[PDB]
Amino acid sequence: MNLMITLLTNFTLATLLVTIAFWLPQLNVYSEKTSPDPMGSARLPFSMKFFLVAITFLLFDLEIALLLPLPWASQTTNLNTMLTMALLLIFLLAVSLAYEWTQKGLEWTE
Amino acid sequence: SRGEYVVAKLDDLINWARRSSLWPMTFGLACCAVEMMHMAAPRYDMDRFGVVFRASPRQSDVMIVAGTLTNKMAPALRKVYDQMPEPRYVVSMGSCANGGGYYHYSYSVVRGCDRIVPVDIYVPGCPPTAEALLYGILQLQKKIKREKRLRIWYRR
Amino acid sequence: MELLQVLKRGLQQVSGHGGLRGYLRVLFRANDVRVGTLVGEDKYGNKYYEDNKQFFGRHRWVIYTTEMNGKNTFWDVDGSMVPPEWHRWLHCMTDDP
Amino acid sequence: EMVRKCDPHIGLLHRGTEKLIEYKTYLQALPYFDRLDYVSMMCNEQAYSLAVEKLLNIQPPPRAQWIRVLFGEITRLLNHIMAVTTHALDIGAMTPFFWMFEEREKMFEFYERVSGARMHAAYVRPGGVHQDLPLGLMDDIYEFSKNFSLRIDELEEMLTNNRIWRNRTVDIGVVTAEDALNYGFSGVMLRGSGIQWDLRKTQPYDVYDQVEFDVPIGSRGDCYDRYLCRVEEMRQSIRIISQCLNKMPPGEIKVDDAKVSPPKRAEMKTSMESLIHHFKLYTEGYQVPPGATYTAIEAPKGEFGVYLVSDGSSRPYRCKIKAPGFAHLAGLDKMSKGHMLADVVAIIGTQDIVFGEVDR
Amino acid sequence: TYKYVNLREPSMDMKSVTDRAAQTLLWTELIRGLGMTLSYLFREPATINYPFEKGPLSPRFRGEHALRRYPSGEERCIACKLCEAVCPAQAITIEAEPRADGSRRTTRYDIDMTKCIYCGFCQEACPVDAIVEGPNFEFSTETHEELLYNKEKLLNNGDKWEAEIAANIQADYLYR
Amino acid sequence: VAAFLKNVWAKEPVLVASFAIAGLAVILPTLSPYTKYSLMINRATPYNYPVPLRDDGNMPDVPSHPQDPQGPSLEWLKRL
Amino acid sequence: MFMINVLTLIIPILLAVAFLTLVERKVLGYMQFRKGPNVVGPYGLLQPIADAIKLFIKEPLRPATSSISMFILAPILALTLALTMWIPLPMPYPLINMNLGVLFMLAMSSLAVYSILWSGWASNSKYALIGALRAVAQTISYEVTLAIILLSVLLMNGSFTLSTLIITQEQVWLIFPAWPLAMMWFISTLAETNRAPFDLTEGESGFNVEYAAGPFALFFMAEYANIIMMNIFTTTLFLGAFHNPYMPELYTINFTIKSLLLSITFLWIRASYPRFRYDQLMHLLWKNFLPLTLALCMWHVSLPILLSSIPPQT
Amino acid sequence: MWFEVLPGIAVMGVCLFIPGMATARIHRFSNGGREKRVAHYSYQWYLMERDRRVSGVNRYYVSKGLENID
Numbered sequence A: 001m002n003l004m005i006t007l008l009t010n011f012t013l014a015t016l017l018v019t020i021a022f023w024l025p026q027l028n029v030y031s032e033k034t035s036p037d038p039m040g041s042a043r044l045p046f047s048m049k050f051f052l053v054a055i056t057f058l059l060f061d062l063e064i065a066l067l068l069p070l071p072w073a074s075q076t077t078n079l080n081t082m083l084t085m086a087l088l089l090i091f092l093l094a095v096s097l098a099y100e101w102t103q104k105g106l107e108w109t110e
Numbered sequence B: 001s002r003g004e005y006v007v008a009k010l011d012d013l014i015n016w017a018r019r020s021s022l023w024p025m026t027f028g029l030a031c032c033a034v035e036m037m038h039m040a041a042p043r044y045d046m047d048r049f050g051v052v053f054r055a056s057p058r059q060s061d062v063m064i065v066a067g068t069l070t071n072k073m074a075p076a077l078r079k080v081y082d083q084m085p086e087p088r089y090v091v092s093m094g095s096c097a098n099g100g101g102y103y104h105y106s107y108s109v110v111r112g113c114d115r116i117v118p119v120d121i122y123v124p125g126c127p128p129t130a131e132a133l134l135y136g137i138l139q140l141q142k143k144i145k146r147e148k149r150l151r152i153w154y155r156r
Numbered sequence C: 001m002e003l004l005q006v007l008k009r010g011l012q013q014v015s016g017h018g019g020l021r022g023y024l025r026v027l028f029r030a031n032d033v034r035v036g037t038l039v040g041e042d043k044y045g046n047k048y049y050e051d052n053k054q055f056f057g058r059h060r061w062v063i064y065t066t067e068m069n070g071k072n073t074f075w076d077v078d079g080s081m082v083p084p085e086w087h088r089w090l091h092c093m094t095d096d097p
Numbered sequence D: 001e002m003v004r005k006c007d008p009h010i011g012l013l014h015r016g017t018e019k020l021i022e023y024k025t026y027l028q029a030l031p032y033f034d035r036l037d038y039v040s041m042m043c044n045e046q047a048y049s050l051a052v053e054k055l056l057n058i059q060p061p062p063r064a065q066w067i068r069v070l071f072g073e074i075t076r077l078l079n080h081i082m083a084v085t086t087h088a089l090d091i092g093a094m095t096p097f098f099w100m101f102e103e104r105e106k107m108f109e110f111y112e113r114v115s116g117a118r119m120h121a122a123y124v125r126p127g128g129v130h131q132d133l134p135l136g137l138m139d140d141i142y143e144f145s146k147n148f149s150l151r152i153d154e155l156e157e158m159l160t161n162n163r164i165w166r167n168r169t170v171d172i173g174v175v176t177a178e179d180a181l182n183y184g185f186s187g188v189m190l191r192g193s194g195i196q197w198d199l200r201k202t203q204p205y206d207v208y209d210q211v212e213f214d215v216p217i218g219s220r221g222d223c224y225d226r227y228l229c230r231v232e233e234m235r236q237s238i239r240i241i242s243q244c245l246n247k248m249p250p251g252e253i254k255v256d257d258a259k260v261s262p263p264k265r266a267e268m269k270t271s272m273e274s275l276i277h278h279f280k281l282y283t284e285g286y287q288v289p290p291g292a293t294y295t296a297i298e299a300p301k302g303e304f305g306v307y308l309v310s311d312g313s314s315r316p317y318r319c320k321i322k323a324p325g326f327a328h329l330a331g332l333d334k335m336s337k338g339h340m341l342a343d344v345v346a347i348i349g350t351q352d353i354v355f356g357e358v359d360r
Numbered sequence E: 001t002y003k004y005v006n007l008r009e010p011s012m013d014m015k016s017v018t019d020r021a022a023q024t025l026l027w028t029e030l031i032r033g034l035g036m037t038l039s040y041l042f043r044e045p046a047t048i049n050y051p052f053e054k055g056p057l058s059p060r061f062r063g064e065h066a067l068r069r070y071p072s073g074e075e076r077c078i079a080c081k082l083c084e085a086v087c088p089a090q091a092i093t094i095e096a097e098p099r100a101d102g103s104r105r106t107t108r109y110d111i112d113m114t115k116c117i118y119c120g121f122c123q124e125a126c127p128v129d130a131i132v133e134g135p136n137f138e139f140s141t142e143t144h145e146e147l148l149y150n151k152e153k154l155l156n157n158g159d160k161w162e163a164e165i166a167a168n169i170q171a172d173y174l175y176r
Numbered sequence F: 001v002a003a004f005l006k007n008v009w010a011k012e013p014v015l016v017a018s019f020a021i022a023g024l025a026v027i028l029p030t031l032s033p034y035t036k037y038s039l040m041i042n043r044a045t046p047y048n049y050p051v052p053l054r055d056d057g058n059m060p061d062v063p064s065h066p067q068d069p070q071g072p073s074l075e076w077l078k079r080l
Numbered sequence G: 001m002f003m004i005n006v007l008t009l010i011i012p013i014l015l016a017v018a019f020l021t022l023v024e025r026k027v028l029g030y031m032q033f034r035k036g037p038n039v040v041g042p043y044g045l046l047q048p049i050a051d052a053i054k055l056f057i058k059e060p061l062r063p064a065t066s067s068i069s070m071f072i073l074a075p076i077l078a079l080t081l082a083l084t085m086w087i088p089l090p091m092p093y094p095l096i097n098m099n100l101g102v103l104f105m106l107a108m109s110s111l112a113v114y115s116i117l118w119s120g121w122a123s124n125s126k127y128a129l130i131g132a133l134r135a136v137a138q139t140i141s142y143e144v145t146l147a148i149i150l151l152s153v154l155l156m157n158g159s160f161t162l163s164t165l166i167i168t169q170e171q172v173w174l175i176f177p178a179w180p181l182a183m184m185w186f187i188s189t190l191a192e193t194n195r196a197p198f199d200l201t202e203g204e205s206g207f208n209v210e211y212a213a214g215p216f217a218l219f220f221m222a223e224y225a226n227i228i229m230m231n232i233f234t235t236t237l238f239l240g241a242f243h244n245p246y247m248p249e250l251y252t253i254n255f256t257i258k259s260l261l262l263s264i265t266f267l268w269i270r271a272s273y274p275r276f277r278y279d280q281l282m283h284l285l286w287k288n289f290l291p292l293t294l295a296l297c298m299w300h301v302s303l304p305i306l307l308s309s310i311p312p313q314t
Numbered sequence H: 001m002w003f004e005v006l007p008g009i010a011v012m013g014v015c016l017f018i019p020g021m022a023t024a025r026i027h028r029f030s031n032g033g034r035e036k037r038v039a040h041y042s043y044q045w046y047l048m049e050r051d052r053r054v055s056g057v058n059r060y061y062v063s064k065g066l067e068n069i070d
């Protein structure tokens, strides 16, 4: 409840400052500008490597999501099984990284 | 009256903030850029006046035209000037920016950047010393200081 | 300790500008508060100081007058307010004021 | 990410310098050379002065030659400080720019004391130099040079063993030596590729055959070897300046042929021949005998040459200016293939390109 | 007479390999660089307090032009046009006539300070030390034509700065 | 076995440290004597209520009070 | 009374961000053998005020945008996320004391890439969009090691609670058992905030070159509102101070001094090195930080089990 | 010299000192001169609501000891 008050206050202060920033110099009548970039009008070429690093982020972020309950999982009574599955998950993250390595997926953004 | 005093204090405030936070574009053309760097160097140190170099003309306040403006470059210089947000200022630095200088009678040189952009401070020299460029920047600050924007706005 | 000498030099910089009023006066006009030997004063009120222990460039300075030729120069001090007889001395074109 | 093609468009500082030279006298044409490579002012003065003196069949006095070599090595310090620190500033290292431009400020004080201008001195003239050293100048050049080694050492502390600096320079801009010679490269651009060529050794001018210095040779031809070559050339320039300060002879500073170099102002106001010669040198200028020279020097960017053609008059008929950066920026297209866009700016930094000499 | 920068093979004993791997993993040269920057943090800076402190200059300095007079008030310039013949930028425009006492004096003496390259060939071509390039460098204007000096502005710069120009020429005429 | 190891320690010390720390993390809990006490402390931590037993008549190993000497103890944890 | 607590959080954040610009310019000045600002205020103290007023009265662009609405939403999201990162920070008591403050801060800092992406959308310049995509891939690359390092440390904390992390370091700093995690964490937070040697928004033109002085001053300050926060977070995470519950200002002075020294350490890093090439910091993450971070995550999984040092759940 | 950077660092340090000292004084003010009750877990919330009931004045922080029982 106080959390929603805080979030709403931060959004309100940000919207206040952004509106004042967009509209305090719009009181000025400075001049009207016509103003008739590295690329001129060429279409943005698709970069395959940027997409590959975004999907590699997404899959390793999912493996992170599996890793996230480990401080609570260390409190279990089945510690041998828990330690085995934790080492197996971090090892599978390392194997996904090794396959991403050796198949040249981490190249030109290495 | 009272509102005259209010707009006088507001003019003093906005002129103070504009002259004490000048941001030139890091943009040199010829030999004057070397001395403009010496005015950025530790001996003169423009940053202690609130004068910093910024790469883009979008976050810049003054264009120090420091070097020879040729015919091949003048539309690029005008485009740089047209991308600057107002209030934007121009400091012509050196004899070629001022009036062509040593290349005045050349087929390829714009005889003075004031054919291309409006110029606020003309700094003379070939090159002017870095101390002389800092003199021109402080004269620009004093020119911004005596601007009367809100007084003229209140009287119009 | 040699920090006590630093604080005592700061306090006698305060005491050397004629108190807190002169200290804050030179702090806001000059943005520097170090004291020197008064080399002279021209007919306008520009005061010229030495400190030969400061490094070359800091060792001679002017405090500009607050009023020259009718213009208030309390804040709007100007580099061309130096008369030509002191312009050699301040720009180190000579050793002699 | 790869650079397939790099097409530099120049002419943005093309000012028609060498058409303006054809309509001015030799003395009037001298200050154009300050403004070509405007971090190498007295070196270009020295190149044009050697060209004119070779066409005039006269020689400067020995003291003027030692002053030319002294201030040319001060100029080499200026140019390599500009080169190294702006090459680091583009890659991102912004701090030794500020650390080394104070030493560069002191060397501009040396130019201002010797000539009255901090950059464009117009000091080295055909026939000697314009004016003798002021008393006490060489002591201050000594006090600068004695401490400048620590400044190079802390620059080299901030860059040479740095892994971020090495990762931006070591695999970058490799030139084979045969392609460096075939693309008209000169200076560090050759000597980074292992080529043992320096014009101060091989084709020596004024008193460089009498000073003792080493020539740093690269091994891999990359940006990093050219960086180390420029650092060690600053070291060897300090060595040459120490030798020039120890071996400065007495004597005159202009050639005593008063039909070339102007007489003293005391004797211009006393002698009839000196006033006539002062008049005619500062209005018409000396006639240069007809002929064409190509005189090159080892300027701190490479071979700076003048192909100067006199038709007999007191004005140059033709003055072609060979600059090193012209051929270096021509070779930029080959040097950047297979590299990335953040590597081309490092290549543009390690070819010390000043567009005043590129465009004239 | 030549030397090889970067022709060192690193040693391959376990001491040096462990030194290089500790440099790699423990960032020794990066702490060296941070230490050099921290060493400059505690230095007195090189910054002078302009305009209250001024950059050092010599009496040879080439700044603002001025026309000098004799120690009788008569102006030194005798209209010989050597300064405008030698002028590399053609910045000097001179017209003359005999004035009312028959003296050879100028009617026009213009220096365009926006063409001028501040090289001082005019002051060293001058046979009577009339045109000089003085000590002033702080003469920036707000208008282009305020730098288009005529004879009145140049004689006023002479009258303004003569107390300093005479001392600079006193300190530097024996080198000329 | 030491030429390849010195070679990879000269070329890729990041990966040598990585595989070494990973190998230690795998094999070392099977060699540590304290791995038993982790299990013992995580079962000695009473998250729930110790629900009492109905005294049937013959449970000598169950105490009648918390301060009785029979039952599980934690002196191994107070000493360690 | 709670609104007074929110305001005394968020207004001194913006003031500290304002004077961080002065501290940056001064400390970079003296490291570069020069001075920073000393004219505008006494010792430069009015320089951020004059600079903020100067920016707020410049003309904005209002360009032809692909989206006007996302051109508005990028500074608002930037400032809102930059202010909400501070609310679970225990100094020594937080504004919002939540059980999962660490995971909260991780999630909200993962949300900060939309400001970069929408600022690249809103400019019609396709090269600004390319630079925005490179910035986003940089930030999402280093979020991976942020998450795994933070997980490895919270295996020694016992919970996701940020106030428990003060109890965790009552005997020793957590930089002593976790300095390789601490140094990869510090460099990764340096790479999160687009901070040198990882900045690719000044040279090869960034994502926020379209913004001029209306929103830009907000973006920038939101960006520095992250930076202090990250250092404060690092101060909570590896340099936990002494907390006396009867004198909380001992903790507040101690963590404030450590966070100031760590932000100055950011300033002292950016004044000492050149930048990375873009694929060089991708090489730094994916090939140098990520194998070590996985190895040390295995080590900090198995290590409390093999030493019988599993931390408390509560 | 280098001590010129210390006024800005001291101002920024006061700006970082204000939120922590502020929330400490506010939590002592709003909670009867003591720390705010931390209720991360439902047992803590149950005890805190039981304190709010047994105080009789609808405040969890008003503590009742042996004087409340006979």
Ligand SMILES: CCCCCCCCCCCCCCCCCC(=O)OC[C@H](COP(=O)([O-])OCC[N+](C)(C)C)OC(=O)CCCCCCCCCCCCCCCCC
Binding pocket: D163, E024, E025, E026, E027, E030, E031, E034, F011, F012, F013, F014, F017, F020, F021, G180, G182, G183, G184, G186, G187, G197, G234, G238, G269, G273, G284, G288, G289, G292
């Ligand atoms: C939080 C408080 C502060 C923390 C410390 C940080 C402050 C100091 C910062 C200095 C400036 C840094 C600026 C950014 C620099 C970025 C570049 C960089 O450093 O890249 C990292 C470099 C990257 O390598 P590189 O770039 O140097 O080399 C190129 C890469 N190869 C070699 C592959 C071609 O190193 C690392 O990744 C190391 C990360 C930390 C390693 C921790 C090792 C732990 C040791 C375990 C034991 C090892 C012994 C053997 C086994 C024993 C078993 C018992």
Ligand SMILES: CCCCCCCCCCCCCCCCCC(=O)OC[C@H](COP(=O)(O)OCCN)OC(=O)CCCCCCCCCCCCCCCCC
Binding pocket: B005, B006, B009, B010, B012, B013, B016, B020, C028, C029, C030, C075, C076, C077, G018, G039, G040, G046, G048, G049, G052
């Ligand atoms: C009814 C009456 C009131 C009407 C409404 C007005 C309200 C108050 C507005 C602010 C004050 C107005 C006056 C502004 C300054 C006027 C005086 C002035 O210009 O003094 C000059 C002097 C600097 O002189 P200078 O020439 O720069 O020195 C060169 C160095 N030798 O300057 C100085 O020495 C310092 C000048 C400081 C200016 C004030 C401080 C900044 C403004 C603070 C309030 C607004 C911003 C609040 C915070 C925003 C977020 C950071």
Ligand SMILES: CCCCCCCCCCCCCCCCCC(=O)OC[C@H](COP(=O)(O)OCCN)OC(=O)CCCCCCCCCCCCCCCCC
Binding pocket: A091, A094, A095, A097, A098, A101, A102, F008, F012, F015, F016, F017, F018, F019, F020, F022, F023, F026, G291, G292, G294, G295
């Ligand atoms: C069993 C233990 C647990 C193992 C699983 C957990 C691992 C944790 C770390 C995860 C790492 C994920 C990615 C690993 C990829 C490995 C393959 C690889 O990198 O091969 C290529 C490399 C040559 O490099 P290159 O292809 O050129 O890449 C650009 C850099 N130059 O070639 C190499 O770098 C050679 C790599 C092989 C040799 C490494 C030997 C390390 C020995 C350390 C001591 C012993 C440790 C005990 C375990 C044995 C490990 C071999």
Ligand SMILES: CCCCCCCCCCCCCCCCCC(=O)OC[C@H](COP(=O)(O)OCCN)OC(=O)CCCCCCCCCCCCCCCCC
Binding pocket: A001, A003, A004, A007, A011, G073, G076, G077, G080, G081, G084, G097, G098, G099, G100, G101, G104, H039, H040, H041
């Ligand atoms: C373009 C759209 C606008 C974009 C700009 C604005 C949005 C972005 C910036 C704001 C982001 C808001 C994030 C709000 C939720 C954060 C997660 C959260 O609440 O975690 C904290 C805490 C969990 O900890 P715990 O201790 O278990 O809870 C108390 C129980 N003893 O949980 C609690 O304490 C629970 C408290 C009650 C429930 C809180 C619910 C908050 C409101 C819902 C989200 C509102 C924002 C929606 C948009 C998000 C971004 C798209």
Ligand SMILES: CCCCCCCCCCCCCCCCCC(=O)OC[C@H](COP(=O)(O)OCCN)OC(=O)CCCCCCCCCCCCCCCCC
Binding pocket: C028, C074, G015, G041, G042, G045, G046, H011, H014, H015
């Ligand atoms: C958590 C901590 C946060 C701290 C933030 C603030 C840090 C800096 C604090 C202030 C430092 C000193 C500032 C002094 C400014 C210059 C004062 C001055 O003398 O200005 C002179 C100017 C013109 O004077 P004039 O009368 O024209 O002179 C002719 C004389 N014959 O006259 C004027 O310009 C008019 C007077 C202007 C005074 C402005 C003072 C500074 C205002 C800053 C706003 C914030 C203040 C602090 C807020 C928190 C505390 C309440």
Ligand SMILES: C=C(C)[C@H]1Cc2c(ccc3c2O[C@@H]2COc4cc(OC)c(OC)cc4[C@@H]2C3=O)O1
Binding pocket: B026, B027, B028, B029, B030, B031, B033, B034, B036, B037, B040, B053, B067, D039, D082, D086, D354
């Ligand atoms: C960033 C700071 C503090 C300095 C460095 C700097 C400037 C201002 C402008 C420029 C600059 O450096 C870059 C790179 O180096 C040269 C070198 C040049 O000539 C040697 C040159 O001539 C036009 C231009 C430039 C750039 C330029 O415009 O201030």
Ligand SMILES: C=C(C)[C@H]1Cc2c(ccc3c2O[C@@H]2COc4cc(OC)c(OC)cc4[C@@H]2C3=O)O1
Binding pocket: B052, B053, G017, G018, G019, G021, G048, G049, G051, G052, G055, G216, G217, G220, G221
């Ligand atoms: C938030 C407030 C109060 C003001 C102050 C301020 C802004 C907005 C933007 C900036 C800023 O302060 C500094 C100004 O100077 C440089 C100079 C820099 O380099 C020379 C540099 O490099 C990253 C960064 C900067 C800051 C910058 O961008 O709003």
Ligand code: SF4
Binding pocket: B030, B031, B032, B033, B066, B067, B068, B093, B094, B095, B096, B097, B101, B102, B125, B126, B127, B128, D035, D038, D120
């Ligand atoms: S005015 Fe002169 S010194 Fe300046 S850039 Fe032009 S040619 Fe070079």
Ligand code: SF4
Binding pocket: E083, E086, E087, E088, E089, E090, E091, E092, E111, E115, E116, E117, E118, E119, E120, E121, E122, E123, E133
């Ligand atoms: S200094 Fe040179 S360019 Fe200027 S007027 Fe004199 S001769 Fe002409």
Ligand code: SF4
Binding pocket: E076, E077, E078, E079, E080, E081, E082, E083, E084, E094, E122, E125, E126, E127, E128, E129, E130, E131
């Ligand atoms: S100033 Fe000197 S050189 Fe020029 S016309 Fe006059 S007398 Fe002759």
